[PDB]
Write a protein that binds this ligand. Structure first.
Ligand SMILES: CC(=O)Nc1ncc(CN2CC3(CCN(c4cc(C)nc5ncnn45)C3)C2)s1
Ligand SMILES: CC(=O)Nc1ncc(CN2CC3(CCN(c4cc(C)nc5ncnn45)C3)C2)s1
Ligand SMILES: [Ca+2]
Ligand SMILES: [Cl-]
Ligand SMILES: [Cl-]
Lengths: 586, 585
């Protein structure tokens, strides 16, 4: 009977169910349209239209009533429908939502809050039914988003527009434009963008404003920027001119990055930032705090023997307090940011830090897709961090899985459950293909280049535990029949799921993962043959063993030889384990 | 000035009370005719071997050595001890006092006096001895080896040498049970040939000489019959076989049920109980019967915290006096935590015996297990009164790990695996100790890639430095110093192994020469791996490709070979370096 609360992302801070729910009518009364946030109303109109829900011209008391507005708008209908629930005591971007007895109230703390209230409403409604809930909600972290800051083919204009919509839908409010292989960002940073590219930029800025996203325009001048004399003045004016060109199209957030460069002129880097902050940021008056990243940006690079290194010390002492400083954690690509690391670096800089999290980015190990949740990031990090971003894959569509979880982590940090969030991300993104995509993506969460880059949740941990249990059972001389049968089913399911994804995934997703799907099919076949080897030894069948051995070997060799990389420590490793296995040594 | 040298086992109580003194060219020996005969023989052997003559008449300028047991009333010994006593110590305990040209050795019993001599032997280095007060005794009552592996059994000469070695390190148990001796297992009814019976007599005599209990094992489980006239015949074959060894002096026996098809729990225990009644109790001077059930690891014995059917029936049936062996959580496993000992001890309602499967390598013969006792809980003596190790078929190189087992079993509470390991190589390899440490450090971790995993990780300090190299490179720090340090490390691996090839005695070298070559090959690959990194840092394509080919070839040779060493350190580093691309930083 009772209408259940569907999947929500981010998880709202406070949600109480206070009723059995109700069906929203074929047409609705909309109150507060003209006074409420324009972008919130546009998003609401889009949703209603897309779900065949008409807006009434005149009030119909038989129709459902939706009341929308901000706390500073005088809407008595909103106050009545809210019934004591308030948004005024909530932080910026916060909102209140109350659905009760054919009335939905949405009250933002501000215009951004009202917009995010609409996003929750959009997720609450399934087949015109809505639960009866009392919500007050607001972000843990002030700035939440993406930094397109990877090497490789930059995202297409269409990728970016789609990403911006997606960020709005999941309450992510920051998009930093800084692709390493854009010549006009970095290599040829002084040169103005072509008109065609400037028109694309304008479209991105408009889409960002439409979805409450701060478009942050990045510039990376550190390769060859000159600091002193007339050359210094010429180059600084190039930064201003470039920034001005994007300011004039609507950009109100800026980043100047010093990462991955030869030059470590600490004072000079900070002085360029301070001058830009004085002469541009403070000058314009409506520009958000300047963002940067120093040349030392991971703790290994920044700290030695618990003390800052020379560059970091000078940069920290020189750089203006208002400037947002990014760092990546203990390493460039690392397992965790524990609370002690954030404490250390925040202490050195004497400010709340910004995070450039290098997951799900795969530019260092392009064969594998990073399809796992936010993992290893301390749930108290908000104590020392006010700005959280992820560096995504060049593969924009499949980056959404990990980004979806980052929205949950950054908005509701204290209740973040990586496993539940990961499942929720695939459920909400893939729909009817969600269960099959889970089977595939479960094998492609761990990033490990075998040396310096290690991050993410382990691949297929439940399957790996069962594989370990097989070897233990065999050594203990127990009957492994039931476990072997279970594993045959697991490996069959991997093949079945991937074949269904090849047949039915939309091309936008399939074009990014087709080789990885084939890779996991090949490994699954090798895994099946690996079980055949074990069963053959148990039955003392040499012919059957040698036949299963050559298949297992061929499948492993193909997997190892191919560009695609997946399930290294689970599906791939199991074949190697099974090839080594000699039952006569038990 | 004179420091306390390496001791094994670590004595329970040791106090330094002086600057030490030089032992003279000749010595006065008091208590010869009253003291333990085996202790005196061991002492004479040591003195003779170190060119120390025994005075006929007392010389006051010569060092004096006074030896005896506590139950003897010997004033010369009491005076030199100066209040230190062995009377309140347990069995095998002793007191030793070195002070102002006098060394006093007092055993609680004959075994203690013997062990006192062993500590004395270790205390002396280049005729100098520290001035110390020692009281000392074992944690665990029965401490030793079970020759219970598959593969070529130890030679008669290997066994005689091992028995001496056990005496020297206060190990008191040697269980004869080699799987591939036909007369032990396959043809267990059949009598040993006279030539082999003479060799057994020699092992028994040597065991007595070194205070070792020779445990004669029989493994009848493959085809023993239990019921009717066939059951009587086969039981009498066990008695007959046991009797043959009893008549040469064997007073400890084992009947093992491991690694057999038959799981007739009640019948296994009934054979043991009948042997216990009709033989052990009958003879009256036979130590408790030792066994091992067919379910002997916790994975095989226990399901959902409760004993499995065989184990339940075996435990309820088997006589309380019988020592039951188990191997820990698995056959070859990382640890025996205290909870596992608790569980299994509780099931059997008795203190357990341990059959520890390290350093045995019969499941993965390519690698030598040269590491210390590792993962065994230091509280295990609560539930365990009998500790043994299954060694490698390689008897000489098994000494390294066995050395540490002597420390662990004698002084459990102060057991430090790292210190014990270093001490084992120092004490065994002498002038080659430093080089042998370099080699053996890479050959401690046993891992067959599936079910058998045990031992300390290989070369952990080097592995940490390799990790630090990758981190430094990613953090864009100057790695010059660390690269140079690693070049030194890899060069040292090659230098140490070549020296060991040239100078190790044949007895050791014949067991490890392939593994020495393996580590040399890996070290050469590791050097070439650094050359690859340096070539990328200098943007030298010619130098990179040259180093790459060498690294590739050395890796392949290492992988293809029978010999296995340093899989996660020296081997893995080459694979890591081949994967490394500096342009992706
Ligand atoms: C009670 C107990 O712990 N008893 C043991 N006894 C020998 C042990 C050390 N090895 C572990 C394995 C398991 C079996 N194995 C081999 C190797 C070869 C070369 N041939 C073999 N034939 C039949 N088994 N087996 C390797 C035995 S532990
Ligand atoms: C402050 C910060 O975190 N800034 C970053 N920016 C990009 C990031 C994610 N990737 C890790 C790597 C390390 C460098 N890298 C590549 C790849 C390729 C294909 N070409 C490259 N050329 C020079 N580097 N580099 C891989 C960058 S993290
Ligand atoms: Ca308004
Ligand atoms: Cl007991
Ligand atoms: Cl020799």
């Amino acid at each position: 009977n009772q209408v259940l609360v569907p999947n929500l992302n981010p998880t709202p801070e406070n949600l109480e169910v206070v009723g059995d729910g109700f069906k929203i009518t074929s047409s609705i009364n909309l109150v507060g349209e003209e006074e409420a946030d324009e972008n919130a109303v546009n998003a609401l109109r889009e949703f209603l239209t897309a779900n065949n829900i008409e807006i009434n011209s005149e009030n119909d008391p038989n129709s459902t009533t939706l009341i929308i507005g901000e706390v500073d708008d005088d809407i008595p209908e909103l106050d009545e429908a809210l019934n004591g629930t308030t948004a005024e005591n909530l932080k910026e971007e916060g909102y209140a939502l109350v659905s009760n007895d054919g009335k939905i109230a949405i009250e933002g703390k501000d215009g951004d809050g009202t917009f995010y209230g609409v996003q929750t409403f959009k997720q609450l409604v399934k087949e015109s039914n809505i639960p009866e809930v009392n919500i007050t909600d607001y972000p843990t972290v002030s700035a939440r988003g993406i930094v397109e800051g990877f090497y490789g083919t930059p995202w297409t204009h269409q990728d970016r527009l789609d990403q911006i919509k997606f960020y709005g839908e999941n309450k992510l409010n920051t998009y930093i434009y800084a692709p390493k292989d854009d010549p006009y960002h970095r290599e040829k940073w002084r040169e103005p963008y072509p008109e065609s590219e400037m028109q694309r930029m304008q479209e991105l800025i408009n889409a960002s404003a439409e979805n409450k996203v701060d478009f942050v325009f990045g510039i990376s001048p550190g390769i060859d920027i000159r600091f002193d004399g007339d050359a210094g003045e010429e180059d600084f004016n190039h930064l201003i001119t470039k920034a001005e060109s994007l300011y004039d199209m609507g950009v109100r957030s800026f980043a100047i990055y010093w990462d991955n460069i030869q030059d470590k002129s600490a004072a000079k880097h900070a002085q360029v930032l301070n001058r830009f902050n004085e002469e541009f940021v403070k000058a314009k008056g409506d520009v958000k705090p300047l963002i940067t990243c120093p040349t030392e940006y991971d703790t290994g690079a920044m700290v030695s023997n618990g003390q800052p290194r020379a560059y970091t010390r000078i940069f920290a002492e020189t750089v203006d307090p208002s400037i947002e400083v990014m760092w990546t954690g203990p390493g460039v690509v690392t397992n965790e940011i524990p609370l002690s690391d954030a404490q250390l670096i925040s202490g050195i800089y004497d400010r709340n830090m910004a995070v450039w999290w290098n997951y799900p980015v795969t530019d260092y190990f392009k064969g594998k897709l990073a399809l796992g949740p936010m993992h290893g990031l301390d749930k108290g990090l908000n104590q020392y961090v006010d700005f959280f971003t992820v560096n995504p894959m060049e593969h924009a569509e499949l980056s959404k899985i990990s980004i979806h979880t980052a929205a949950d982590y950054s908005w509701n940090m204290d209740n973040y459950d990586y496993d539940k969030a990961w499942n929720r991300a695939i459920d909400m993104l893939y729909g009817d293909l969600a269960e099959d995509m889970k089977v595939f993506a479960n094998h492609s969460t761990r990033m490990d280049n075998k040396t310096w880059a290690k991050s993410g949740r382990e691949d297929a941990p439940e399957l790996r535990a069962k594989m370990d249990e097989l070897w233990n059972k065999l050594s203990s001389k127990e009957d492994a029949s039931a476990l072997i049968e279970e594993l045959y089913g697991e490996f069959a399911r991997m093949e079945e799921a991937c074949n269904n994804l090849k047949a039915n995934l939309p091309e936008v997703a399939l074009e990014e993962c087709s080789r990885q799907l084939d890779e996991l099919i090949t490994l699954a076949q090798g895994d099946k043959a690996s079980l055949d080897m074990i069963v053959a030894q148990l039955n003392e069948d040499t012919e059957a063993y040698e036949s299963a051995k050559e298949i297992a070997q061929n499948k492993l060799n193909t997997a190892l030889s191919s560009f695609a990389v997946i399930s290294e420590k689970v599906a791939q490793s199991f074949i190697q384990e099974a090839l080594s296995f000699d039952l006569t040594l038990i």
